[PDB]
Every structure is written in C-alpha cells, then in structure tokens.
Design a protein around this nucleic acid. Structure first.
Lengths: 92, 91, 87, 92, 91, 92
DNA sequence: TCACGAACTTCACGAACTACGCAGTTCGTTCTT
DNA sequence: TGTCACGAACTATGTAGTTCGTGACAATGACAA
C-alpha cells in the first residue's frame, strides 16, 4: 500500500493514532485527526482497520463515539514501541 | 481504501532503510535488503526516492553500486528520530 | 521483450514530455499505451537522476522535464539518427 | 524483462545488433560485438532470441559461423526504424 | 578448456527438457524448470534453440506462454531415444 | 560449459567414451575417436578429466598409451547409466 | 453528524525475464616432447 | 604421430534489476436522510 509518503517517511499514521490513545486513554475520531494533524479521512479509514483487527473497540459514553485500545491493541503497541526503540538507539 | 500490512504498521520501510545506512555507512542495495528484511524491490524503490530528494548518493566501485547517507540525509535522520523520542515521552 | 524491440519505455516517456513539458503520470500512460506501473517505475528513476522533477500543484501532481533532462533527451536523439540514417 | 537500463536509455541492445546487420548483411557473433561495444554475452543473449522468433539464421559455412537477417528480419527492421522518425518529430 | 561439471556428465540439460515435453505436451518456462531441477535460465536458452530449429512452437495464453513439441521435433525426440538404447546395449 | 550443442542433443561426448570403454575395456586414445563420432581433441580433453578424476587410468601394450575404466569409474557409469534409464522409462 | 462508499494517485513486492559476468567446454591450430 | 597448450566460439548459470501486474493505501469531493 502507500505507507512511505512525503508526509510520513518514518512513522505511519497508525503510529500517531495508537500513541495518542496511550495518552488520552480514549478520544473521538475527530479529536485524533486534529490532535495529530493527520487528515480525518486517513484516521477513519485506519480506525476501521484497527477495529476490524481488534486493536481498538468503540466506547459510547454520551452520543459521541469513542475509541480505546484493547489488550491485543496494547500488546501490539509494545512490540512496535520496542521495535521503535532499537531504531532511535543507533543515533547514539 | 483497504489496509492490511504486517511488516510495517508503525514504521515505514523507508525508515528501516535510512537507519540501516546511518548504522553501517555504505551498503549495496542487496545488503540493505537482507539486513532489514525489507524485500528487494521495496529497498531499491525507496532508495530511488531518497536519491531524488538528496538524502543519499551512488558510488560505483568496479561492478557494484553503493549507497550512503548525505549530510542532508544525516540531518533528516537524526531530526526525525528526535521528534520520535518526543512522542515516545510516555513510555 | 516484444513491445520494446527497438525503443525503451523511457523514450516514449521522455519525448512525450518534450512536447508537453508539464504532464501527469496517469496521462502519459494513456498517450503511449505504456502500462501505468511501467511508467511511474521510470519516473522514480528519472527523479532519482535529476532528469525530471515532480511538482504537486496544490493537490495534483505534474512531472516536468528538467534542464539536465533536456540535454540527455537531445543527445540520445542524435544517436538514434546516425543509426537510422543508414538504411 | 530488463531492456531499459542506464546503458540503454532509448535504444535496446538489439537495435544495434539488428541495424549493424542491415549494414553488412551477414556478420559473425564475435564481430557484431566489437563494432557496437556491447558485452559479447549480451550479444548472443539476443542472437538466440533472434533465431527463435526467426529474424536471423546461421551460416555454417567453412569454419566460422555467420548470422544474417532474414525476410521477416529485414521487414521488421525497417518497420521499427521508420516509426523512430514517427518520434523524432520533436527534433524539428 | 577444463571440465568441472557433475550434473551433465552423460545427459545434457536438453534431454530432460525434450523428455519433459513428452510428459505433458506443453508447459510454462517455470513449469519444466522446477520439474527437472534444471535452472530456469538454461531452460529459456534451450527452448530458444529448439524454437529456432523448429522442434517446438509457442502458444501465448494470458500472462505467459506454453511450449509444445512439434512434429519435426517428435521425430528427433523419438529417434534419439532409440540411439540411446543402441548404446545402453552394453549390459 | 558447452555440454549441449547440435551434435549433443541428449548425450554428451563423456557418454560415448565411457560406453566405448564399457565395451572394449582398453581403447587407445586415438582409437576411441574413430569408434565414436567424437573429434580427437574433444576426446583427450575428456580423458584428461577422467584421468584427473580417477575414472580412468593409463596402460602400455608396448609404446602407445591405452586408457581403461577403474574402481571409481565403473561405479559412475553404473550410476549415470541408471539416470539415463530412469529418464527414458517415462517415454518407453 | 459521522463514518462510509467511490475515485485518484502513488506504494509494496512478487513472477518472470533480461544485461552481462564467470567458468566452463567444443574443436581447431601451434607446440612440445 | 601423440599429447599439451593455446585460442576463438558457444553453453551453463548466478546476480542484479526491469516490466508490469496485484493488493493496498493516503486525502479527496460525494452519498447517506
């Protein structure tokens, strides 16, 4: 697929998502888009994949949808985070 | 539209490529491939993006082309890797 | 190879750029019948050598030919002439 | 296949092979190479393909072996040579 | 010139090719390779010799070609195998 | 290596020789040539290999040099001989 | 409203085939012995 | 003479890279009522 575009180079949008959620614990689709500057339609498409893959599960609180990580979607983030460490390790 | 990826949900193959050079110096498009597990085609395809941008250059020795970061490439790598540690300030 | 017994897909791509200047990839593939993938393949190469340059007009993209590319185009053309003139 | 490489920007190696044959009728493998400067191996690489499709035939004359274009060899030689002018429009 | 080799001491790669055609009538270039242990490279160069000598003829289908023995080729294939046993008549 | 050329479609020269010796046992270098369609230079070029491999050894009936199969040698024939038969079997 | 489906373009990368080196090998001439 | 060394031409095959297909994909300008 795309992946390596002039915008991303190093991190894929899905990394900006997961990470963001590791902070806000949960947030609305629109929030993510703006909060990471990634165009909305990139977010919604990627969240489907996340949902479908079981890394994210919705959480209706009011009438607004929310997206939170799952165990599997948390374990995942570690694998990629450590993988992401070994890279930024070389700079030193 | 659709999304799958196993090899890179977090990092782009381009990423894995930039760093491998920073960590080794010069390398044949072959070696790049083998040590990053990024299958050949992608390796060269991305390398050509890098050239066209000014982040790496060729080096014919005898019958073997070598690639290595440029200063512009060097600055970029460390620059982004920096912005990385930032977001990963929640580990 | 069949379609390319004499001329590379590069030729059809280069020349068609000499007589348009500005040009999208998707389009070139139409005006030369050279499969789209076979084309951006060469754009990626062209860009990598300075013979061509991208130019994302806002949201669209236009691949124009460069100074350096211009000369290469002319040069490799006489070669074709000294070759063909002898029939 | 390969075809288009840094050495062959516009012209295949077989262009030279073929042309130089219209320009000498029958030539031998070792020869086709020297007058053109393309690596001998690439030359037979093509010569074989030429025999297959039926654009050339060998001359088992005497000791050395010779190659010359054929009826359908010469025809498809000018065919391609002409529509090269079909391109050099930009050159005028 | 020196003679290393250890695969083609008795049999040229051409035999396994010619013979395999008798087993299927027609086959792709990768088909007969993987099914004769003879490198795909040497196959092409060989069918390209057979085509040139009319012992075989193509037949494009979709994204690949299939090669089939012809009639003048069948004579050859058949004849030789006879020439073979005439020699195998040492035991 | 050459191996397969117009003369050698199925069988190599290394076949017709090893066979000739499985017949008369001890043939003269020269004599192997005539008894086969093999040109002299091709024969000794293969002998020197056989010799260097221990598939063949020398011998003198007077002054001429006769060649003969050996321990390592015959096992080879009675090894390849099987491959050639396992092959043809299919089209028997 | 918000995610969704259609639409454009570029990306990932696998199959197959080519450009071309290397290491044989067929045989024909010098050359040694 | 017989064998070796040279020596001109092709075969075998591996390595890197090309064509061009398929399966994504990023960021749009509409459905979807």
């Amino acid at each position: 697929g795309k992946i390596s575009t002039d915008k991303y180079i190093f991190l894929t949008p899905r990394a900006y998502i997961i990470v963001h959620l590791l902070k806000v614990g949960k947030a609305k689709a629109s929030e993510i888009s703006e909060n990471t500057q990634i165009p909305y339609q990139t977010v919604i498409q990627n969240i489907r994949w996340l949902l479908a893959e079981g890394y994210v599960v919705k959480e209706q609180k009011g009438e607004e949808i929310y997206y939170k990580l799952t165990d599997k979607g948390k374990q995942l983030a570690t694998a990629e985070l450590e993988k992401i460490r070994k890279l930024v390790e070389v700079v030193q």
